[PDB]
């Protein structure tokens with residue numbers, strides 16, 4: 158059934174699985190009309206589909222044209238996500254298709270279930286974890302490719318850079334979730350932490366800076382401080 | 395006016411005949427039910443005094459043969475039997491009537507309840523659901539599972555209702571996934587009405603038959619089937635106007651007849667609120683909505 162703290166280690170076993178997050182598929186700015194009414198203008202979005210064991214990120218970019226003339230976009234977005242995940246699965250060789258797909262919001266279950274009826278053996282599951290994948294657009298290189306897209310496009314990343322050379326996927330995921338939680342709680346502080354040292358750069362083929370093992374420990378400490386910090390500034394504790 | 399003769403009543407039992415029920419004591423001198431209206435299917439049903447577990451009974455049509463009930467002390471139930479010797483049959487019934495040993499099917503002349511509950515239930519169509527070809531009547535009980543329940547275990551003793559499953563390739567056209575899931579008109583009108591049932595009369599008959607097995611036997615798979623057939627219509631944006639109007643009449647008499655004290659178990663809150671307040675047909679079932687609101691507002 159659902160995914161939570163009790164079965165957390167299942168993410169790093171050898172059954173292929175994908176997280177799907179649809180938070181950033183349908184994105185708008187809200188603004189005033191000349192008549193003083195309110196209207197939205199959509200902006201490009203993305204589906205965040207992640208293999209937590211390998212770090213492979215299938216970033217499907219949702220170009221604003223996909224909404225033209227459509228109604229009920231928030232509902233449509235869940236079905237468009239499902240359509241694109243189903244298309245991704247069908248494009249993968251059989252030995253690469255996932256045995257499970259975990260959605261980060263329960264409203265994706267029925268759309269994805271329906272789009273995957275052809276794959277009765279792929280388990281579609283919710284989770285009780287409050288994962289911070291919404292913050293993916295706070296990673297500059299992901300935000301950049303999304304905003305620059307002039308047409309639908311799939312881009313592939315390893316969201317763990319080269320981390321798996323030195324640490325396990327459990328640790329790699331833990332780091333990623335801590336970074337994304339910080340970016341979600343205070344993006345400016347988080348980025349200042351990441352980027353206040355010019356001696357540590359982001360390689361052209363990477364998303365995050367080239368921290369040594371010790372620097373990552375320092376960085377992780379600062380991110381936990383910030384999350385507690387803002388949790389005080391928020392709750393006055 | 396036809397008759398169902400009982401050889402006797404050796405065990406204390408509550409006897410149902412359509413929407414009526416009466417008590418017979420153990421070894422009471424009882425020889426059956428007379429004045430049964432010709433032209434309708436009927437159901438005769440049983441609940442033993444000593445074990446209200448297992449309601450059971452028989453769907454029959456008097457035009458299809460002469461039928462009698464005989465208790466079987468080995469299998470422990472009232473069985474329906476066909477008597478092929480028509481003379482011997484009329485002879486025994488006439489003796490039982492002369493001695494006034496039969497209760498009277500007590501139809502009030504104003505009353506169209508049974509007609510309205512059974513308008514599209516045929517006996518040959520009932521046999522398509524309850525498979526036992528050597529008899530002209532069909533046995534049902536509380537515990538019989540449906541062919542769909544057995545997909546999720548004796549196939550001989552199952553109720554073969556039409557399988558309805560909203561998250562199935564049958565229900566969903568490739569390339570129309572959101573369309574067909576959010577508006578089930580394709581599944582209703584093309585898959586079910588045109589390709590399985592052939593007409594809405596047939597669609598209503600199975601729905602009527604699932605309701606009555608739910609109500610008279612507490613048969614859970616039947617209740618599931620009744621609610622699924624309602625929900626398929628209510629969830630379709632495009633339904634013939636005459637099917638909606640008839641559906642409203644059908645459900646009205648079902649809700650009217652339901653025992654007040656069983657509404658908590660026989661009525662699915664989610665389906666009914668969806669159908670009356672959220673679905674495409676939320677404005678189309680005026681009679682059903684009025685009786686539901688005045689009779690079971692707690693379910694809503």
Ligand SMILES: C[C@H](SCCO)C(=O)Nc1cccc(Cl)c1
Nearest residue numbers: 399400401462477482483486487
């Ligand atoms: C076959 C047995 S013959 C046993 C008496 O000869 C039977 O009971 N027939 C039947 C016909 C009409 C009414 C009833 Cl209640 C029964």
Ligand SMILES: C[C@H](SCCO)C(=O)Nc1cccc(Cl)c1
Nearest residue numbers: 411413414415416497498499500
């Ligand atoms: C008590 C309910 S209502 C009474 C008739 O409307 C009932 O069915 N009574 C009944 C009594 C004896 C024989 C039969 Cl067939 C019915």
Ligand SMILES: C[C@H](SCCO)C(=O)Nc1cccc(Cl)c1
Nearest residue numbers: 515519520522556596599600603
């Ligand atoms: C098509 C199905 S046969 C079952 C498997 O699909 C059918 O005829 N149902 C039906 C129609 C009228 C009355 C009754 Cl009781 C059932």
